From a paper:
Inosine 5’-monophosphate dehydrogenase (IMPDH) lies at a key intersection of the purine biosynthesis pathway and represents an extremely attractive target since it controls flux of the guanine nucleotide pool. We have overcome this major limitation by designing a variant that lacks the non-catalytic CBS subdomain (MtbIMPDH2ΔCBS), greatly improving solubility without impacting enzyme catalytic properties. Here we present the first crystal structures of MtbIMPDH2ΔCBS, including the apoenzyme, the E•XMP•NAD+ complex, and complexes with IMP and three inhibitors, MAD1, P41, and Q67.
The apo structure contains four polypeptide chains in the asymmetric unit (rmsds for Cα atoms of chain A versus other three are from 0.10 to 0.12 Å). A phosphate ion originating from the crystallization buffer binds in the phosphate site of IMP, anchored by hydrogen bonding interactions with the backbone nitrogen atoms of S339, G376, G397 and S398 and the side chains of S339 and Y421. Thus the conformational dynamics of the active site flap may contribute to the differences in inhibitor affinities among IMPDHs from different sources. Interactions with the hypoxanthine moiety of IMP, E458, and AB-subsite are especially important for high affinity and selectivity. It is important to note that while the active site flap is partially disordered in all MtbIMPDH2ΔCBS structures, different conformations of the flap are observed in the apo structure and the structures of the complexes.
Residue numbers in the entry: 27 to 127, 253 to 431, 452 to 528
The structure:
């Protein structure tokens, strides 16, 4: 436990120190890898390996069929959002399936209606069902995962989330999950940690979930909080097998929504699925906000920047594969270390394709 005395007589009350992406850097190591020779393939689930270890979020401002098609063509996968009627979601799965036999996932909730939705998605040819919940360590979520796996698990892979602890990941593994999705609160548009006061910083959440999942051979999906290509490398080094992205993809041409023009600039709508506008869950109050992000152009170019940065990280850490990157070491840093990591003491005059102010 956290050794430092911070009050009371119970040393387990404050149980650990949580780190997130900006708290760590990957240490370079001996290398015979250059970005060109790195292999970025990685398991999405026990049975499915992607060429690029990225998936798009199941949000109504990120992933519909156009995004799912573009993600699969880029070597990743999209998870179709579930904020729409069951027949429309199933229709979108079909749209993706008839664009080349591309991989696709789709989100479902828990309960009878979610069950009907799942069954329809499976009939439509979905490859991955994602049981998409705020708190997967609730007994009802574990049941849903276990039952889908029992009924359709031969035909479809079943992902469960979200979790932020070792015990929750362990419960999902025991329920038969084919992958575990980690992230309680880190999302750019999420307010769970603020309105409920609940969560775990994302690097520690990954390390803890992986401590349960890795020995069981179950891939971890790092969901939320990623803003730069280097964050993907950190998530994967912490032990995740793939990263799920919302904000980084919401600004692309393929994300749903029309372009927003404000003050000579271009934006796209991006909102939490727990935001008032989205709910319109078991929630009594919202756990997200509604906002906008800058327009970033074609998905393909964004993914090229992200995989290029990941490949650089693999070259620096001497990792020929994602499986080796998962063994890399971190150094913890201070606020000055973070300031030093970004550009500092200079005015940027030109935008970089992989770095914005
Ligand atoms: K947040
Ligand atoms: K720097």
């Amino acid at each position: 436990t956290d050794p430092v005395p911070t009050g009371g007589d119970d040393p387990h009350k404050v149980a650990m120190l949580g780190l997130t992406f900006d708290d760590v850097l990957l240490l370079p190591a001996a290398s015979d890898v250059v970005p060109a020779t790195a292999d970025t393939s990685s398991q999405l689930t026990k049975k499915i390996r992607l060429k690029v270890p990225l998936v798009s979020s199941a949000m109504d401002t990120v992933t519909e069929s156009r995004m799912a098609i573009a993600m699969a063509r880029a070597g990743g996968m999209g998870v179709l959002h579930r904020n729409l009627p069951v027949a429309e979601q199933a229709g979108q799965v079909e749209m993706v399936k008839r664009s080349g036999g591309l991989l696709v996932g789709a989100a479902v909730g828990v309960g009878g209606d979610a069950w009907v939705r799942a069954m329809m998605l499976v009939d439509a040819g979905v490859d991955v069902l994602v049981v998409d919940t705020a708190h997967a360590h609730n007994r009802l979520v574990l049941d849903m995962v276990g039952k889908l796996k029992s009924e359709v698990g031969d035909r479809v892979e079943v992902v469960g989330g979200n979790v932020a602890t070792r015990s929750a990941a362990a419960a999902l593994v025991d329920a038969g999950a084919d992958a575990v999705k980690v992230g309680v609160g880190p999302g750019s548009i999420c307010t769970t940690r603020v309105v409920a006061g609940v969560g775990a910083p994302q690097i520690t959440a990954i390390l803890e979930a992986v401590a349960a999942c890795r020995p069981a051979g179950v891939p971890v999906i790092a969901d939320g909080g990623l803003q730069y290509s280097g964050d993907i490398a950190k998530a994967l080094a912490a032990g995740a097998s793939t990263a799920m992205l919302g904000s980084l993809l919401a600004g692309t041409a393929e994300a749903p929504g029309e372009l927003i023009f404000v003050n000579g600039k271009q934006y796209k709508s991006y909102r939490g699925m727990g935001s008032l506008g989205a709910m319109r869950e078991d929630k009594l109050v919202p756990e997200g906000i509604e906002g906008r992000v800058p327009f970033r152009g074609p998905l393909s170019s964004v993914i090229h920047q992200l995989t290029g940065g990941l490949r650089a990280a693999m070259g620096y850490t001497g990792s020929p594969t994602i499986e080796v990157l998962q063994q890399a070491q971190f150094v913890r840093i201070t606020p000055a270390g973070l300031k030093e990591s970004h550009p500092h003491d200079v005015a940027m005059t030109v935008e970089a394709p992989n770095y914005y102010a």
